[model samples]
Target: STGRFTLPSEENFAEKTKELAELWGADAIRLALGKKIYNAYFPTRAHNEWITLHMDETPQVYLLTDRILAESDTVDIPLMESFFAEQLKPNRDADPHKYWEVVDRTTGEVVDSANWTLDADEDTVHVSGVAAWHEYTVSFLAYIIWDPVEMYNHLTNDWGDKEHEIPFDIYHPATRKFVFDTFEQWLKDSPQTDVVRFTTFFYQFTLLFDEKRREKVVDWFGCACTVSPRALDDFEAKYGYRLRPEDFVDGGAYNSAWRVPRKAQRDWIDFLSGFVRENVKQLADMSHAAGKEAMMFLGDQWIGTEPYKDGFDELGLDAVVGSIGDGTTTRMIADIPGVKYTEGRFLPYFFPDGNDPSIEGLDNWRKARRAILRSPISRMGYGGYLSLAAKFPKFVDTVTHIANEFRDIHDRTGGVAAEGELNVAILNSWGKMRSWMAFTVAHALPNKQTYSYYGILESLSGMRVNVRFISFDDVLAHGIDSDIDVIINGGPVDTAFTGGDVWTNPKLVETVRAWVRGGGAFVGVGEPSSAPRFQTGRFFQLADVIGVDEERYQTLSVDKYFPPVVPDHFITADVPVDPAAREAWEQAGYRIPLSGCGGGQSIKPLGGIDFGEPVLNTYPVNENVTLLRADGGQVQLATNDYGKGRGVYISGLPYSAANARLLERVLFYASHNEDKYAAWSSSNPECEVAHFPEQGLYCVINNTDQPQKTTVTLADGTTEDFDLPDSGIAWREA
Candidate 1:
């Protein structure tokens, strides 16, 4: 059992501060670790280097001040001649020495301090070495020198009962704002993983600006030569054994572009500058406004190859690590905190396609190519600088704080969302965070980023809304009706619905069947392919009610499975074609790949279902159910006579396209409260809705690119149309 210790008195606290400070100061001036000091600063080139002496010996501090202050002894110190140490360096294999610079705090004299040594002390096992720096001798000395009573009384006399003399917000940038602190605090408070590269960004060369074209070319070169698992697989096949990491970490196949001369070839800067020039300056302004600056920094720290060692020093360093030398030579350099490179699978969520502009919409045709090349084409993770920037929070914060805000500027130039601008940092941070998670998972199991081949549809359309995840209860709660109209079901089945009952619960299935028998319209997509056994009437009872013969139901599967082309069955006609209406539709939803088939299906040129007709996705059909648009000519969209007094419109395809247009037409009819309109609208839109107990409601929406306006009618004959935000359902009280 652990026992709680009593708190120390105020006097003890004062004593500790005094004792700790003196120990630290004395420890600073008279390096007890026998640690040798070394430093070098190149001024004409404005370069600096520092190296501490280290060997497998009893390590101890070696202070470089020529001073001895004791009760009776005193000595004067001389600059430059006061410190000396054995310089550590890679052996004559042409290996270089460690890099570092040391400057005298008292006299401002600088020198190369790389070859210094410090032996560890056996007595103090934990704290081994210290870096040279200035300290407040008076404050630390005063504590050990002054009595506690004197210090406490003096502190109190100067201020009243204030909790703290300085505001907590002032010292830390993280706590500067509620939003900033909250976002970052939660991010940091949770588990953090290093950001690693996951996917290579792909750019279409046709879209780059002149300035951006070369940079993109450079990127294409740098990223193209990735270590393919194919190479490893082949090696294992040939050698009959697994290859060690060191064998390939550095010798992987590289792109031809890497061989290009730096001065002659295009790089990231040229590409980005072109991007900056083409994007209306709003994005740059927003990035600036958000306090996130976008720039490149070349440093010598881990350039790896000898050719790149002096890269930055030669190119005017944008950022530099402690010293510009090989870490293997400088043991002290290896000890520097927070300076390790990460390598692995990672993806940043920096999407570039904020808004799509037509050729006519582009303000500058000259650079359109570059803007498109640099911007997000589909999902995130294509650039290197951004990939690194998004992951390093400390670096991100530093850049953001120093950069200007861009949200307002972007709003002024374009109609983009302000929230989008604010979320630039958040998205990048999340990407970095997720990249780490992916690495942790992949290291345990072979994995790859989800974007090797897919597009926005994978990230947006398929991913669920209302929630990031889902459950079976969500499926069972669907409420539908099939009354006074026809019923049809066909489409590729949910893979999970393989053999057993598609409805997770038998009761749910019974409810749907009962509702249809009572009177309603019902339609199912992609199931009854031309095969007899796959017919609508064979698996479901509603098929029998709709006069659909299992043998004659006519399944159209084989030829209609591809995308980028339209199916003959869907003819878009009489559908309202207003620009604002189209805009609204576009904003509501978009199509995604289903079973690798061109975006499911869309019901265009709706022949039978007129504008503002009532449409139902799933509904119960009774003995008195009416037949509408059978034989697959027109899509049946509404249902009547569901459970108790409820009615429904079971949509065929998820709103994406086919069902959404029908839904809109059906909903217009449903809202009129006229039987003729009900009959008409009920047969138009075919979306399904069900109210589940304590679970609010569950809806299977299919409007891929537009929001739907739905109206729910209560038992009292009162009804109202709900303008659904986009792509799926409406739930109301029973």
Candidate 2:
């Protein structure tokens, strides 16, 4: 065995220059090229061994630490000495034959490892050495180099570039190679660490509760897509609409026209070409640009029925049958009580087995249904909240029975690891405060999610979420009137308005109007068109201002549902065309058996303002807000606006992932971006700030105990940082 290496005394360096002293004790002063610095002082133990080879200045971090090296109880000093000597030998000698002269001060003995190699560069010096089979720690003495240095040059060239290099773990851009910056970035871009897009399939919950807070909720019913028959007919007569694309096995809206009905291929081709290239394809491009993944899950078409099972005799388990059809299949069930029945399932209705005809039709629908249930129901809302808290002992124990199962699946599969697995889940609570379930899943499931945020204050918390309730009276008394200076003012004409119809108190309207006009704070829930229309012994006259086409106004009873939720319907373009309509009608393809048309308030173009063609937008209905067009204005699929100096106005319906994509608008409108739009938002405020600023923020909170984080892309194309504090507390850009 050899003795440890030692450094020459400071006295030797005092008389002779550092270079001279180093020459005098060349054998003893083993040196290296680079140095490492610690942020805080590490207490050096007298017995501890360490390698300290300091350069003129700091050096770039180029390292791949050995896993074993980090866990050593004691370090090896000779290995370090040999390592440093190896690096310096090239600079010290002309030939490899006269490499490092090893000398041990502890015993005045000489040791040599000429087999080791060292190489030097402008930036770093690499030393090649070996360790024993189980040896770990590498240690030695330290020194300072006062010569040409690389770190100084690096600092001079890229001052303050460190922040960019060492970016936040989540948002850092991908890098080219291995380094601190690139390593962190690579982790973010890693396919293993990448965010897997887990589908939140549409699952309408039982609306046993509908008590909206401080707001009057006249009707509580679920809404689903209903393709218009006329639209299909037009497609059929025009383009020979087929179940699937000619070449592809799946059917998605590759390109579709604004109007469904069309005659001849030109009309169809032209419309689809423009829309697909400009809007639909644009959205896909944007999603990819934002580093998001796309996926779709087909909802079961069995309405309220289960799969077919002939006493489990035919198949091991329940035999899957058609998605929608009249057969001995166990799916021979009816529709949800208040809902309408239709032939097609969710958006993904048809899956073409180009080679096989037996697996066609409704049976394809059933296959989609089974795929949807692969992800079991996750606990949301109250159920979720209780499960998250260790404080709830008994409840926590009970929750494990359900939550553990899903979490186990997630753990086992690494959260849907299978490729092309269309896993979907619904994550919304029952209505407890005018909260929408599907909307919650859309926003929260993507990233940050919540479990509650049901009441008005909860909604105001800038957490886009909803809950379920049972009656309108409780909601109106608590939801609408529970807070500040504004309130939705109106009721069914037959019930509240008489020959002398008017607000029970005119002051309420005056107060609200003054608030808007005077720039005072106010809040108002956009009343649904199906809300009770009070017959003011006088007729309501805000029709033109509300953007409604006054000529289309129709009378309805107090009990009749406004904007009746029909399963299907067509929204004809504002432009008029007789021949085009006839031609289009002939080519229409799929259509909804039942459709509903929303008859909310309309507004006439004020001043030089024109909503133009909203394309397919769910934007703020109020004025003074700025909108972000991610899907391009052509297909303004989703939007939220923030007013410059004024308050905010928002409106729209989100019934699908296509609809759930409100990140851009929500984040743009809600962020603290003043130069673009002045949104009244704040984490902490002395003055009352709008909890949910229409412009600056669009929040998607999943009221589920299951942890979630939503990636909210702002209206201006920014995503908000998210955190899951607890079950019901998650915040995203929108």
Candidate 3:
């Protein structure tokens, strides 16, 4: 019964709780998780982790980590050492050549089948005929007896509690009863529990531990765990085809989200999602019956719960919660549909790394504020050991300031749609199903994610524009939505986010072409709409539209036309295309004031728009176009006129004050609405303008930790000047 902030609390720490709660403006507390699985319990000799149930314990499928064995003809590769107990078993039926093989790590050559064999007892891959000094590793599938995450958590915490928690196979009739009864009992015992938070209902992403107790494989969208004997049989029953183990291993890539999901992978997700939906609905229905609300945590076991997919609304829940890492991730949670409300769990969780909350906590809020302001979630909260947080007084103060600011922003912009200038659709393979969850490993998990494409979403999150995430399927089914004025697609080649087999879909290709032909706009970055690498034909599928093509060594000799940097275009008007160009412009009374989080330690880097990828374009194009090439003469930016529309392609867009403005310039120009861009825009790229017309509230923010000067030009041509302090904000009556 308070503000939209939830304070973390622990029992028996009443004094600290009272003090911190009062300091941070307390509200609701959180209740988190369960048992220590020593070695996950798998029935019978079906598995072997702790006990030697099967004497001839041959290793099942196991992929080599990025582990490199250098210059050793004789290598005692111990598969048994790195993997968890009950998590592996020898696959007697799996063929060595077909299902398992070793390859040269450096040369990409598959070692001969004769060169490698399972050693006696079968836990090791014995290889001969070896290049004595070559780096070697093996790829194989072993029976996964217990979930890897389950076992990892067990050993990670050194818990000697109950038997390893064998993942209750809901597909099994016996476990189904155990699950239902346990959950029923859980709900019955906890009458005070108002919210039964389903921290993701079952099914974990494929995760494994290496010999050194380090992560071997982690895919937030991994399907490796769903391949149970029953589930596999069930999939065959439904799909009319059996999936190969290779589908899960994917040559050790583990079908990560980075790759475009194959049909098998997509079907697997659908199948698992259907089952998860059934169980969740049943449990959610139970929670409702008990006068308790049910919400879902969209992380970890979030694999089966496709929050952004069609029909998610049917999996009834009171709210959806996800980790909010930055502005982009804030939108990822905020933009989710089919839920009563959405909540974002911010970073600097009350943990070891989160010790210095005064810094990290504010950092998290700083990154999240831009998006939260534009598209605020229904609620926000913290997670982890409250005891650790209470010891840090500054952490309490940070949360206090954050909660207060968030409440004000939420109140002022309640029910606001984050749209004004124009509607833009982010086109990709996952489409709306993933929403803001693009180019990410799970929702905000600290995996080494590529930041270039992430910057695109970051820019949109804080900008005064209507942003929609769309899949190629959305277009293929409903065609482009009328509200979408501009379409943007960026990422590496062969990715679902960028271009791959998706671009091969003629319906999608033609649909985009026709839309652009009918005056819709397009801004492509990296390998925008690139053809499959193997296609070796028309690298940029819409090269005809964008007026630029990647050479890919295909046109090394055929290059008669080379485009140079067109320095005078509207998009390049403020950008420093070349270093010397900036100096030259400065001499001519031209100064492009750059701004963003990068300008201030307290500001989020994404706030200013500093996203970039390496030089991508190679040769030239023949299309009539205006181009800006880098020092090396590779086209970094290109714009061309198509049937009444426009195509603007940037080889890459690294965030900067200039790049932020650069993106704005490109978007408006391509949308053929440049005349409207300046109306409510900030002249200083370091500053931003936001409005709540319905509430008569207009605001401008300086996203830097320094004083800045900017002029605000309104739609009616009235202008006002202001000097803002370090990370300052001003509100005015519109």
lDDT top scorer: 3
| Model 2 quality (TM-score) | 0.21
Give candidate 3's TM-score: 0.82
Off by over 4 Å in 2: 1-405, 408-472, 479-654, 663-734
Tens digit of per-residue lDDT, candidate 3, span 1-734:
24566666567886766666566555556632221101111211222332233322221234553445755665545555656545665454546565666777667777788777778675777777777667766666556555565577677677677465444345555555656776777778876677776756666667766556577677666656654545666789999997765566666677878788788888888888888888888877988897877888776566677887777888788888788887777887887888998888887877764345576776677667767667778888887788987677776777787777777776777757544788888888787777877777644543324666666777777778888888887788899988788999988888888848778778888999999999999998878888756456478788777877776866444533443344577876764445564455334431132332111011111121233555444434663577554333356677989999999887766444567678878889998998998887788888888877788877777776668899988777888898997566777766
Kindly give the stretch of ten consecutive residues in candidate 3 with the minimal lDDT sum. 597-606
For every candidate in turn, the CA RMSD to the true structure comes to 28.4, 33.6, 7.8
What does candidate 3 score in Cα RMSD to the true structure? 7.8
lDDT of 1 at 651: 22
lDDT of 1 by residue, 1-734 (tens): 11100111122244432332232221110022222111111101111110111111101111122222222221122211221111111111111112112233334333222322211321111111222342100000000111111223334455354232111110112222332333233335422211111110111111011111111111211311111233334445654664332122112212122121221112322332232232213322332343432211111111111112122123221111221111111111111222221111112212222233222111121111111111211111111223323344453332222111111112222311111100000011112111111111111121132111011111112111110111123324544322123222332222211112333345645654664455433333322211233335343333433322222223333112212111122223323345664445334432454552333223232223321222222222232333223212222432333333223223233222333344333322222222422221212132323223233322232232345565543334555555554233333454
Top-down TM-score ranking? 3, 1, 2
Q: Which scores higher on TM-score, 2 or 3?
A: 3
What 10-residue stretch in candidate 1 is worst by lDDT? 136-145
Model 3 clash number: 21
Off by over 4 Å in 1: 1-490, 493-500, 503-506, 511-523, 528-538, 542-628, 631-640, 643-659, 664-734
Better of 1 and 2 by lDDT: 1
